[PDB]
Design an enzyme around this catalytic site. Structure first.
Site, mmCIF file in Angstrom:
data_model
loop_
_atom_site.group_PDB
_atom_site.id
_atom_site.type_symbol
_atom_site.label_atom_id
_atom_site.label_comp_id
_atom_site.label_asym_id
_atom_site.label_seq_id
_atom_site.Cartn_x
_atom_site.Cartn_y
_atom_site.Cartn_z
ATOM 1 N N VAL A 90 16.346 -8.889 7.131
ATOM 2 C CA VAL A 90 17.727 -8.988 7.591
ATOM 3 C C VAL A 90 17.654 -9.036 9.114
ATOM 4 O O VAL A 90 16.781 -8.373 9.694
ATOM 5 C CB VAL A 90 18.547 -7.804 7.042
ATOM 6 C CG1 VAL A 90 19.635 -7.362 7.988
ATOM 7 C CG2 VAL A 90 19.119 -8.141 5.668
ATOM 8 N N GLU B 29 15.790 -14.533 11.325
ATOM 9 C CA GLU B 29 15.310 -14.013 12.606
ATOM 10 C C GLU B 29 16.489 -13.721 13.527
ATOM 11 O O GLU B 29 17.280 -14.618 13.837
ATOM 12 C CB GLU B 29 14.320 -14.970 13.280
ATOM 13 C CG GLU B 29 13.056 -15.227 12.475
ATOM 14 C CD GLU B 29 12.223 -13.976 12.283
ATOM 15 O OE1 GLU B 29 12.255 -13.095 13.168
ATOM 16 O OE2 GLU B 29 11.538 -13.873 11.243
ATOM 17 N N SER B 30 16.600 -12.465 13.972
ATOM 18 C CA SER B 30 17.801 -12.011 14.670
ATOM 19 C C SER B 30 18.076 -12.844 15.916
ATOM 20 O O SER B 30 19.205 -13.297 16.135
ATOM 21 C CB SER B 30 17.666 -10.531 15.031
ATOM 22 O OG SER B 30 16.617 -10.323 15.960
ATOM 23 N N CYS C 57 20.612 -1.347 10.553
ATOM 24 C CA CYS C 57 19.489 -2.117 11.069
ATOM 25 C C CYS C 57 19.816 -2.627 12.465
ATOM 26 O O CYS C 57 20.784 -3.383 12.623
ATOM 27 C CB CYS C 57 19.162 -3.282 10.154
ATOM 28 S SG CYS C 57 17.709 -4.226 10.669
ATOM 29 N N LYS D 274 15.552 -4.425 -2.726
ATOM 30 C CA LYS D 274 16.054 -5.738 -2.345
ATOM 31 C C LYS D 274 16.402 -6.566 -3.581
ATOM 32 O O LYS D 274 15.670 -6.539 -4.575
ATOM 33 C CB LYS D 274 15.020 -6.479 -1.499
ATOM 34 C CG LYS D 274 14.655 -5.770 -0.205
ATOM 35 C CD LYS D 274 13.615 -6.553 0.582
ATOM 36 C CE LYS D 274 13.236 -5.833 1.867
ATOM 37 N NZ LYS D 274 12.221 -6.591 2.648
#
Ligand SMILES: *CCC(=O)N1CCC[C@@H]1c1nnc(-c2ccc(C(F)(F)F)cc2)s1
EC number: 2.5.1.18
Lengths: 235, 235
Positions: free
Chosen positions: B68, B81-82, B28, B55
């Site tokens: 993720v 939240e990245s 990802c 999941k």
């Protein structure tokens, strides 16, 4: 008049005087109301120049390539766009009370809550523009429950705690207009979010920038007709 | 270790003190942002991979979006939240700062991140779709030109100066997959961006997290089959 919006044929503004900052705004735009709430809450010396969003001047795209409002411009010619970015910039670069918590996790929380709100302004805009309203009002309630769950778990009145903070000002403008459109039935299933609306109206900064329900409905009727006089509603 | 936890898997125990957990996925790009920051700052951490097609039932209590990356510290605090996870790590941990504290500079990188926001949507369309590959290549070129203009106007190697910073790690994961998606011709007209890519590959943090061509190939094929073993390609 200084508040009258600038359209095609208007001269681009001169240099921002030192000690002040310029906000390219629109008096009925919720995204810009975010920035103006922070400017008011932090007592930041600023000047306002409204952009006729239905008659946008071509020079405004130099200030922001997205041609969107709000836009900040300091004396060094530096430009900041995106509403949330402008608010955080003002909270950092200026003295006074911090609308954002100093703790890295608590500030990350407000940003996480902002992300939980991200879908609302788009659904809110499509609902304003066929009588499919019933579906868009249901999509409202779904997003509102996500905010309701935050207030339920935090066990506080505001989204940042017992005191008003940055995240409240970021979310408020869309719920301010919710009451002006007689759409309060969309939050009768979110009691804590409804109480939060009432608590926001008690805030001095919020009530200073409130738009009456007649001004918003009059503007929105002109804006949906793409009237070049929409952004200057109420002089 | 790297094997993803799926449905029916046991939720992990508490995070040990002095450490932090990242709920990730090896292929990802959004999660690679957080893993790049964890490696660049030398943060002791553990990685728990989640089968994004199967999941775990408990993972939705870690992130309501079921997405993720997710950070979990020894206090049980959860950050998703990245971009938020990357900013949280850079603030909550010592060492070299990856994000500038200067309000304008940090606002610029966030504005650059907004200019990049179209690429993750376009990459998902190229991976998913048909003869829209030619149309998607033009979009990549036009979006990459926006990044090429940023590097040109800054007269620097990276998006945050002449040394690698946070904004470079936030944008790199999508440029890393460009070669495996045979989209290298989309940067032939962006020389500064080509030089940026070559400099990123020489970074020690980026180099340690690179993925082989045949691993991203197998993962995409399996993801293009809705396989519960896609996230665990190569095992
Ligand atoms: C920047 C200006 C802008 O975004 N707009 C001007 C008119 C259209 C658009 C909107 N701004 N706020 C809107 C709105 C509509 C409905 C509600 C609701 F709460 F649902 F009642 C809230 C906000 S459209």
């Amino acid at each position: 008049e200084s508040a009258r919006s600038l359209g095609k044929g208007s001269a681009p503004p001169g240099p921002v005087p030192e000690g002040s900052i310029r906000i390219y705004s629109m008096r009925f735009c919720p995204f810009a109301e975010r920035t103006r709430l922070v400017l008011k809450a932090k007592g930041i010396r600023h000047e306002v120049i409204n952009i006729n969003l239905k008659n946008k001047p071509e020079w405004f795209f130099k200030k922001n390539p997205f041609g969107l409002v709000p836009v900040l411009e300091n004396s060094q010619g530096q430009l900041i766009y995106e509403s949330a970015i402008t608010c955080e910039y003002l909270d950092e670069a200026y003295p006074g009370k911090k609308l954002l918590p100093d703790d890295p996790y608590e500030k990350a929380c407000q940003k996480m809550i902002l992300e939980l709100f991200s879908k609302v302004p788009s659904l809110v805009g499509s609902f304003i523009r066929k009588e499919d309203y019933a579906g868009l009002k249901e999509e409202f309630r779904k997003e509102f429950t996500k905010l309701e769950e935050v207030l339920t778990n935090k066990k506080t009145t505001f989204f940042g705690g017992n005191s008003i903070s940055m995240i409240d000002y970021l979310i408020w403008p869309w719920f301010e207009r919710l009451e002006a459109m007689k759409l309060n039935e969309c939050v009768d299933h979110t009691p804590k979010l409804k109480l939060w609306m009432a608590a926001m109206k008690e805030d001095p900064t919020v009530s200073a920038l409130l738009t009456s329900e007649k001004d918003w409905q009059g503007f929105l009727e002109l804006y949906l007709q793409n009237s070049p006089e929409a952004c200057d509603y109420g002089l």
